[PDB]
Design a protein around this ligand. Structure first.
Ligand code: CLA
Ligand code: CLA
Ligand code: CLA
Ligand code: CLA
Ligand code: CLA
Ligand code: CLA
Ligand code: CLA
Ligand SMILES: CCCCCCCCCCCCCCCCCC(=O)OC[C@H](CO[C@@H]1O[C@H](CO)[C@H](O)[C@H](O)[C@H]1O)OC(=O)CCCCCCCCCCCCCCCCC
Ligand SMILES: C/C(C=C=C1C(C)(C)C[C@H](O)C[C@@]1(C)O)=C/C=C/C(C)=C/C=C/C=C(C)/C=C/C=C(/C=C/[C@@]12O[C@]1(C)C[C@@H](O)CC2(C)C)CO
Ligand SMILES: CC(/C=C/C=C(C)/C=C/[C@@]12O[C@]1(C)C[C@@H](O)CC2(C)C)=C\C=C\C=C(C)\C=C\C=C(C)\C=C\[C@@]12O[C@]1(C)C[C@@H](O)CC2(C)C
Lengths: 168, 177
C-alpha cells in the first residue's frame, strides 16, 4: 500500500521489493496483466540500446570514420547508412542476437532461472558478490533510463532544429 | 434538519459536516448522485482541482498584469490574447506544459478512482506538503477551510477573467478602471 514513488497511489501489487530499481512506479498497472520478467527484460534491452545510441549519436556528430559516406550528421546518417548497406550489417547481427534472445526469454519465462537481462556477459568482473551486482544493476537501470530520455530529447531537438551537438 | 446556508431547504443527506466549507448549499441535491462514476468523492475531488486551478490562474493573471511579464516573454496586458503570442514564438513550451499536465491528470484520475475504491485517501489529497505547513491537526481543518474558500473565490474570479478577456479583449484591471 502507498507505493514509494507515488505516495498517494496504491502499491502496484506486483512490485513488492524484490527487484532492482523497484520504487513501486506503475500507475497504469502494466504489471497487472504482463509478466514482470518480460517487462524487466524489455526495459533493460531499451536501456542498453538507448545508451549505445546516445553515445553513438553524440560521438558521430564529432568524430567520423574515414570515407565520404561517413561525412553526414547523425540526423541524416540513417538514410545514408541504409543506402550504403552499413545498417544492413547491424541489422543482420542484431537479428542473430535477437533470435538467441527469443530462445533466452522463452526459457526464462518457462522456468530456467535466468534473471531478466542476464546474459552472463562479464569478461571483467565489476561485480563480485550479490551486493556489488545489485548496486551495479541499479546503476545500469538508472543510467539506461536517463539515456533513453536523453536520446529522446536529442532526436526531438535535432529534428526540430538541425543543429550540431548542442541541440538547443 | 434544515441546511445552514439555505434555511428553506432540508439538510442534504450526503453533506453532514465533514468537508471543509460545508454549509449545506446543495439546492439541486447533486451530492446524492451515484452514477456514471460520479459521487460525493468525485464531486469533491473535482471541486478541489477546480479550486487549485482557479487559484493558480487568478494569481498568474494578476501577477503578469501587475508586475509585468518575465524577461523574454511577450507583453500586451490581455492574458487571453498573449497566450497566442507565446505560442507563436515558444510553441515547445506550451506543448511540454500540456504533455506534463496530461500525464499528471492521468495520474490524478487513477489516484482518484483508486482512493474511491479502497478508501484510504481523502478527496483532493496528493500528499503534497513539502514544507510541512499542515502536519498537526486543529490547523489542518483551518487550512482546508481557507483553501476551499479561496479556491471558490478564485474559481469565480478566473471564470470572470476568462470571459472578460474573450469578450472585451482587454486586461482584467483594464476592465476594472
Ligand atoms: C545503437 C547503436 C548504434 C547504431 C545503430 C549506430 C549507427 C551508425 N553509426 Mg554509430 N556509434 C555507436 C552506436 C551506434 N551507431 C557508438 C556506441 C559509438 C561510439 C564508439 C559510435 C560511433 C560512431 C562513429 C565514430 C561513426 C558512427 C557512424 C554510424 C553510421 C554508419 C556507420 C556505422 O554503423 O557505425 C560504425 C560504428 C563504429 C565504428 C563504432 C561502433 C562501436 C559499437 C557500437 C560498440 C560495441 C558494441 C558491440 C559491437 C555490440 C555487439 C552487437 C551484437 C548484436 C553482436 C550509422 C548510422 C558513422 C557515421 O556515418 O556517422 C554519421 C561514424 O563515422 N558511429
Ligand atoms: C553505465 C553503464 C552500464 C553499467 C553500469 C552496466 C552494468 C551491468 N551490466 Mg551492462 N550494458 C551496458 C551498460 C552498462 N551495464 C550497455 C550500454 C550494454 C550494451 C552493449 C550492456 C550490455 C550488457 C550485457 C549483455 C550484460 C551486461 C551485464 C551487466 C552487469 C554485470 C556487468 C558489469 O558489471 O558491467 C560493468 C559496466 C560498467 C562498469 C560500465 C562502464 C563501461 C565503460 C551489470 C549490472 C551482464 C548481466 O546481465 O549481469 C547480470 C550481461 O550479461 N550488460
Ligand atoms: C533527458 C533529459 C533532457 C534534458 C536535459 C533536456 C534538455 C533540453 N531540452 Mg529536451 N526533451 C527531453 C529530454 C531532455 N531535454 C525529452 C525526453 C523530450 C521528448 C522527446 C524532449 C523534448 C524537447 C523539446 C521539444 C524541446 C526540448 C528543449 C530542450 C532544451 C531547452 C534543453 C537543452 C527545447 C530546445 O531547446 O530545443 C531546440 C525544445 O524545444 N526538449
Ligand atoms: C489533455 C490531457 C488531460 C487528461 C487526460 C485529463 C484527465 C482528467 N481531467 Mg483534466 N485538465 C487538463 C488536461 C487533461 N485532463 C488541462 C490541460 C486542464 C487545465 C489546466 C485540466 C483541468 C481539469 C479540471 C479543472 C478538472 C479535470 C478533471 C479531469 C478528470 C475527469 C475527466 C473527465 O471525465 O472529463 C470529461 C471531459 C470534459 C471536457 C467534461 C467537462 C465539461 C465541462 C462542463 C466544461 C465546462 C466549460 C464551461 C465554460 C480526468 C482525470 C476533473 C477531475 O479531476 O474531477 C475529479 C476536473 O474537475 N481536469
Ligand atoms: C493555471 C495556471 C497558470 C497557467 C496556465 C499559466 C500560463 C502561462 N503563464 Mg503564468 N503564472 C501563474 C499561473 C499560470 N500561468 C502563476 C500562479 C504565476 C505567479 C507565480 C505566474 C506568473 C507568470 C509570469 C511572470 C509569466 C507567466 C507566463 C505565462 C505564459 C507562458 C508561460 C508558460 O507556458 O507557462 C508554463 C511555464 C512554466 C512551467 C515555467 C502562459 C500563458 C509568461 C507570459 O508570457 O506572460 C504573458 C510570463 O512572463 N506566468
Ligand atoms: C489559499 C491557498 C491554499 C491553502 C491554504 C492550501 C491548503 C492546503 N493544501 Mg493546497 N494548493 C493550493 C492552495 C492552497 N492550499 C494551490 C493553488 C494548489 C495548486 C498547486 C494546491 C495544491 C495542493 C496539493 C496537491 C495538496 C494540497 C494540500 C493542502 C493541505 C495541506 C498542505 C498545507 O498545509 O498547505 C498550506 C498552504 C498554505 C499555507 C498556503 C501558503 C501560500 C492544506 C489544507 C495537500 C492535501 O490536501 O493533503 C491532504 C495536497 O496533497 N494543496
Ligand atoms: C469574481 C468577481 C468579479 C468581479 C469583481 C468582477 C468585476 C467586473 N466585471 Mg466581471 N465576471 C465575473 C466575476 C467578477 N467580475 C464572472 C464570474 C463572470 C462570468 C464568467 C464575469 C463576466 C463579466 C463580463 C462578461 C463583463 C464583466 C465586466 C466586469 C467589470 C464591470 C463591472 C460592472 O458592473 O460592469 C457592468 C468589473 C471590473 C464587464 C467589463 O469588463 O466591463 C468593460 C464585462 O463586459 N464581467
Ligand atoms: C450534462 C449531462 C448530465 C449527466 C447526468 C449525470 C448525473 C446527473 C444526475 O443524475 O442528477 C441530476 C440531479 C440529481 O437530482 C437529485 O437526485 C437525487 C437522487 O438521485 C435526489 O433525488 C435529489 O433530491 C435530487 O435533487 O438533478 C438535477 O440536477 C436537476 C436540476 C435541473 C435544473 C434545470 C434548470
Ligand atoms: C478519459 C479521460 C481521462 C481519464 C480517466 C482514466 C485515464 C481512464 C483514469 C481514471 O480511472 C478514469 C478517468 C476518467 O479519470 C478524459 C480526459 C479528459 C479530457 C477530455 C480533457 C479535457 C481538457 C480540456 C481543457 C482543460 C481545455 C481548456 C481550454 C482552455 C482554453 C484556453 C484559451 O487560451 C486559449 C487556448 C485561447 C485563448 O484565446 C482564450 C482561452 C479560450 C481562455 C483553458 O484551459
Ligand atoms: C526532461 C524530461 C525527463 C527528464 C527525466 C529525468 C531527469 C529522469 C530521471 C530518472 O530516470 C532517472 C535518471 C533515474 C530513475 O530511476 C528516476 C528518475 C528521476 C525518474 C522529459 C521531457 C519531456 C518533454 C516533452 C514531453 C515535451 C513535449 C513537447 C511537445 C509535445 C511540443 C510540441 C510542439 O512544440 C512543437 C514540438 C512544435 C509545435 O509547432 C507543435 C507543438 C505541439 C506545440
Amino acid at each position: 500500500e502507498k507505493s514509494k514513488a507515488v505516495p498517494f497511489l496504491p502499491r502496484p501489487a506486483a512490485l513488492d521489493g524484490s527487484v532492482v530499481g523497484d520504487v513501486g512506479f506503475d500507475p497504469v498497472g502494466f504489471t497487472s496483466w504482463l509478466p514482470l520478467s518480460y517487462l524487466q527484460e524489455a526495459e533493460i534491452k531499451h536501456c542498453r540500446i538507448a545508451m549505445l545510441a546516445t553515445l553513438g549519436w553524440i560521438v558521430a556528430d564529432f568524430v567520423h570514420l574515414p570515407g565520404a559516406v561517413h561525412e553526414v550528421s547523425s540526423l541524416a546518417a540513417h538514410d545514408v547508412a541504409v543506402k550504403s548497406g552499413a545498417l544492413a550489417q547491424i541489422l543482420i547481427w542484431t537479428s542473430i542476437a535477437e533470435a538467441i534472445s527469443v530462445i533466452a526469454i522463452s526459457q526464462m519465462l518457462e522456468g530456467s532461472g535466468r534473471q531478466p537481462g542476464d546474459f552472463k556477459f562479464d569478461p571483467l568482473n565489476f561485480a563480485k558478490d550479490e551486493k556489488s551486482l545489485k548496486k551495479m544493476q541499479l546503476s545500469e537501470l538508472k543510467n539506461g533510463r536517463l539515456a533513453m530520455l536523453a536520446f529522446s530529447g536529442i532526436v526531438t531537438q535535432a529534428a526540430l532544429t538541425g543543429h550540431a551537438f548542442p541541440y538547443m | 434538519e434544515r441546511s445552514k446556508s439555505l434555511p428553506f431547504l432540508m439538510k442534504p443527506k450526503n453533506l453532514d459536516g465533514s468537508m471543509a466549507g460545508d454549509v449545506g448549499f446543495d439546492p439541486l441535491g447533486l451530492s446524492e448522485i451515484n452514477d456514471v462514476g460520479v459521487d460525493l468523492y468525485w464531486l469533491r475531488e473535482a471541486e478541489l482541482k477546480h479550486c487549485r486551478l482557479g487559484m493558480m490562474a487568478a494569481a498568474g493573471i494578476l501577477f503578469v498584469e501587475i508586475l509585468g511579464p518575465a524577461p523574454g516573454f511577450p507583453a500586451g496586458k490581455s492574458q487571453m490574447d498573449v497566450f497566442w503570442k507565446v505560442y507563436a514564438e515558444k510553441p515547445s513550451l506550451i506543448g511540454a506544459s500540456l504533455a506534463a499536465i496530461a500525464i499528471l491528470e492521468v495520474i490524478s484520475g487513477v489516484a482518484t478512482t483508486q482512493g474511491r475504491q479502497n478508501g484510504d485517501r481523502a478527496p483532493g489529497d496528493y500528499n503534497f506538503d513539502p514544507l510541512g505547513f499542515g502536519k498537526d491537526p486543529a490547523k489542518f481543518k483551518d487550512l482546508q477551510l481557507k483553501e476551499v474558500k479561496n479556491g471558490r473565490l478564485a474559481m469565480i474570479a478566473a471564470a470572470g477573467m476568462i470571459l472578460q478577456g474573450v469578450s472585451t479583449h482587454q486586461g482584467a484591471l483594464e476592465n476594472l478602471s
